[PDB]
Amino acid sequence: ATKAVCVLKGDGPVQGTIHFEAKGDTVVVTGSITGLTEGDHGFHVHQFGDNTQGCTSAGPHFNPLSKKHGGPKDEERHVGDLGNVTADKNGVAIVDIVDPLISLSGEYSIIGRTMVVHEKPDDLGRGGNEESTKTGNAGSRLACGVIGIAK
Amino acid sequence: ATKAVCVLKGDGPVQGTIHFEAKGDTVVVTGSITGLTEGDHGFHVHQFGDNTQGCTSAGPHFNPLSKKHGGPKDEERHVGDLGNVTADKNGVAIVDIVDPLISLSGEYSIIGRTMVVHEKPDDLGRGGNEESTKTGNAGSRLACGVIGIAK
Ligand SMILES: [Cu+2]
Ligand SMILES: [Cu+2]
Ligand SMILES: [Zn+2]
Ligand SMILES: [Zn+2]
């Protein structure tokens, strides 16, 4: 696809709508999330578009290259690693990202996978431990959605 | 993918989990639905995995080859026309479909689009009006979900 979309729901106050658009070989991710506690939350494309167990069955991060966990800019990162999104004091987060690694077709295509917002900030793989190299220690999954074709 | 999955939700009693698997040049589609009234209900793949306005934003049937609506057997159908599932007296429909037209990859991939279960029976394009040739007069979209990649 050239355009896709994601509606984030959970069993909490955290809702959002994430928009995806293919520009050459980057994905412009745009949107907002509401209900967040102030500050950073990890923002990851997890592997499966599977909601049979809420956000739990989305699996780990989309990582077809078997890299370590990392931030959007690091060479060592999962493809699904889109780093942190920041909520203001009103709990709202404008999403604004241009990523050349995730995509909306071919392999690395995120279509039909799961966009997750996390309870905790992502330490971007740079942490005193080994969960850091897996999840960035972004903690729980607050809200998630299957990324579907929009246009 | 070679497997996908779909959680049917709406604002209603109706809910279901639909399982797709690539089997040779066919997709076998299995699962169950509940909450329905008895007898036949249309069961279609709609074009957009766009859940922003619930099932409404899914759009029309997946129809990349611009054919008029039909039943899954017809020369002339949409790729999304999987026909009817039948609810027994207890509101329960056991899904069991193998289709040669829909795919989990390539052109015709149904990953990222929407599975919809309708209010009324599809008429397979054999009503006598425009609504037959587009919709099957299947009625309102009771429950839908986005088709995601499954382990
Ligand atoms: Cu994550
Ligand atoms: Cu339909
Ligand atoms: Zn990661
Ligand atoms: Zn149709």
- Domain at A5, CATH number: 2.60.40.200
Report yes or no: B57 and B49 within 8 Å, Cβ to Cβ: no
Distance B138 CA to ligand 4 centre (A): 9
In b/e form, how buried is each residue of B36-62, taking b as 16+ CB within 10 angstroms?
beeebbbbbbbbbbbbeeebebbbebb
According to DSSP, the residues that pair with B118 across neighbouring strands are B141
* Active-site position among A40, A41, A46, A113: A46
CB pairs under 8 A between A and B: 83
Question: How many residues belong to chain A?
Answer: 151
The pair of structure tokens assigned to B30 is: 């299995």
Pick among A146, A147, A151 to test the B interface (most B CBs inside 10 A): A146
Q: Which residue, among B7, B2, B59, has the nearest Cα to B33 in the 3D structure?
A: B7
The pair of structure tokens assigned to A35 is: 């209900």
Q: Do B5 and A149 touch (CB under 8 A)?
A: no
Three-class HEC string of A31-72 = EEEECCCCEEEEEEEECCCCCCCCCHHHCCECCCCCCCCCCC
**In angstroms, what separates the C-alpha of A52 from chain B's closest C-alpha?**
7
Experimental approach taken:
X-ray
**A44 labelled binding-site residue:** yes
Residue with tokens 């999104």: A85
C-alpha pair distances (Å), A19 with each of A3, A7, A16, A117: 8, 9, 10, 14
* Domain assignment of residue A13, given as a range: 1-151
| Nearest-angstrom CA–CA distance, B122 and B129 | 13
- Strand positions, DSSP E, B9-128: 15-23, 26-34, 39-46, 52-55, 81-87, 93-99, 114-118
Q: Which residue, among A87, A91, A75, has the nearest Cα to A124 in the 3D structure?
A: A75
**In angstroms, what separates the C-alpha of A94 from chain B's closest C-alpha?**
17
DSSP-derived 3-state class of residue A134: helix
Q: Strand B114-118 to strand A3-8: parallel, antiparallel, or no bridges (unpaired)?
A: unpaired
* Active-site position among A78, A113, A122, A123: A78
**Secondary structure letter of residue A22 according to DSSP:** E
* Active-site position among B41, B69, B77, B113: B69
If one counts the domains in chain B, the total is 1
